[PDB]
């Protein structure tokens, strides 16, 4: 009889059985445990601002050989220290040190974007100015 | 607070964006009818979806059901009025077979093109937007009008437009000054 009960009065068993077995789903488990709220460095938000502490030279994961440009960032709202990628070419020279940056995830929902080990976040703004603006020379960072 | 103003969308984006067969047809459709966007096709197909959904639900009901006897007749009268489906039917047939080409064939952009006052779908669209058209007594500039089959004989040029007397147009008025300035 296919396993599961079929009787017209077995709705409770089907309900409880489904409830128990939804815990084997990764997304349901993560949502109802509140892991993003309690463990993720953004606290469950899309973005976070922080202060650059140091320039990074994260090596590429095999088989690619490259030095990804990243920054240690201590988030303002938490104090948690994260690593954010500075995406485009030469944009490290815009995010040098001690500035206030806006960070976003990599699109992997908390995993590695590519051959970059351990990096979950990327830079999108520097001192209130979009990193794409500085890379395309449309705007310039405040000199004073 | 004041009661909220309701609003609703009119178009729907296709599920798969880069479809060669669908992309070619839609841009082929825009050329033959002079439309500016794919959204101008998306809305017609969205409008058609609400119509096929309406007739499909109605046709699941049995014959001589008061719901489809009233709602089916109302949908027929509205669609016949706008001229999308043929008027020589009384069988609730064409509705589910209505194609996208039927709806934008009834638009004023093409309606004034084939009525001889426009000479092109692009010329009509510019003509439509520049207000050289009156449907009844009233000037319109809507490329998507859905003429109600009582206005195809009512179309005419706007009285407040060139070729209507006492109104040559701004560029003509400048040449009127040039006519006197040329001698002087």
């Amino acid at each position: 009889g296919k396993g599961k009960p079929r009787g017209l009065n077995s709705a409770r068993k089907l309900r409880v059985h489904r409830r128990n077995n939804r815990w084997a789903e990764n997304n349901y488990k993560k949502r109802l445990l509140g892991t993003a709220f309690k463990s993720s460095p953004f606290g469950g938000s899309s973005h976070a601002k922080g202060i650059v502490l140091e320039k990074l030279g994260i090596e590429s994961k095999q088989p690619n050989s490259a030095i990804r440009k990243c920054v240690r960032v201590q988030l303002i709202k938490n104090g948690k220290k994260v690593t954010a990628f500075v995406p485009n070419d030469g944009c490290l020279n815009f995010v040098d040190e001690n500035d206030e940056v806006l960070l976003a995830g990599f699109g992997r929902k908390g995993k590695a974007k590519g051959d970059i080990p351990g990096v979950r976040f990327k830079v999108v703004k520097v001192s209130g100015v979009s990193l794409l603006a500085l890379w395309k020379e449309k705007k310039e960072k405040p000199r004073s | 607070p004041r009661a909220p103003r309701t609003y609703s969308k009119t178009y729907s984006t296709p599920k798969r964006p880069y479809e060669s067969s669908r992309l070619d047809a839609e841009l082929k459709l825009a050329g033959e009818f002079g439309l500016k966007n794919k959204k101008e096709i998306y809305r017609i197909s969205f409008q058609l979806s609400k119509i096929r959904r309406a007739a499909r639900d109605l046709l699941t009901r049995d014959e001589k059901d008061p719901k489809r006897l009233f709602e089916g007749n109302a949908l027929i009268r509205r669609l016949v009025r706008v001229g999308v489906l043929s008027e020589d039917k009384k069988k609730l047939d064409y509705v589910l077979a209505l194609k996208v080409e039927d709806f934008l064939e009834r638009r004023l952009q093409t309606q004034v093109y084939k009525l001889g006052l426009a000479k092109s779908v692009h010329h009509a669209r510019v003509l439509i937007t520049q207000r050289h058209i009156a449907v009844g007594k009233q000037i319109v500039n809507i490329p998507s009008f859905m003429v109600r089959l009582d206005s195809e004989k009512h179309i005419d040029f706007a009285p407040t437009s060139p070729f209507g007397g006492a109104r040559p147009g701004r560029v003509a008025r400048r040449n009127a000054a040039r006519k006197a300035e040329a001698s002087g």
Binding site: - | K137, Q138, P159, T160
Partner: protein, 134 residues
């Protein structure tokens, strides 16, 4: 005054306010729109009820010109429109000249200040004056 062809529609006899209630629609080809000093006296002569007992408003121009529709109303007398016509329309038509008044911010602030004062206030000025020396 040429082919203005002003006319009224839906004329209903409203004697509780003692007036005639209707909508007024004008056809003004080759014309922007007709004004108050034109429409009001034109509505007066067509009705022969009074001169300043006429009121018009609304008057949206049809999309693309040509004609305009709005609302109108005619009283039995000018002395009867004085008792019913709204004040802002009377001031607009010239039947009353409103004296300048303090702004809402300033009016409310003055009410806040004199609510802080109990009594008429004549004696308060004397005590402050008598105590101002030291």
């Amino acid at each position: 005054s040429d082919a203005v062809t002003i006319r009224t529609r839906k004329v209903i006899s409203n004697p509780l306010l003692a007036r005639k209630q209707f909508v007024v629609d004008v056809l003004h080809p080759n014309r922007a729109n007709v004004s108050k000093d034109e429409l009001r006296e034109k509505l007066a002569e067509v009705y022969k009820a009074e001169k300043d007992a006429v009121s018009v408003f609304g008057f949206r121009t049809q999309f693309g010109g040509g004609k305009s529709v709005g609302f109108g109303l005619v009283y039995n007398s000018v002395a009867e429109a004085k008792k019913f016509e709204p004040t802002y329309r009377l001031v607009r038509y010239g039947l009353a000249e409103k004296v300048e008044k303090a702004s809402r911010q300033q009016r409310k602030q003055k009410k806040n200040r004199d609510k802080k004062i109990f009594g008429t206030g004549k004696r308060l000025a004397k005590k402050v004056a008598r105590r101002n020396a030291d």
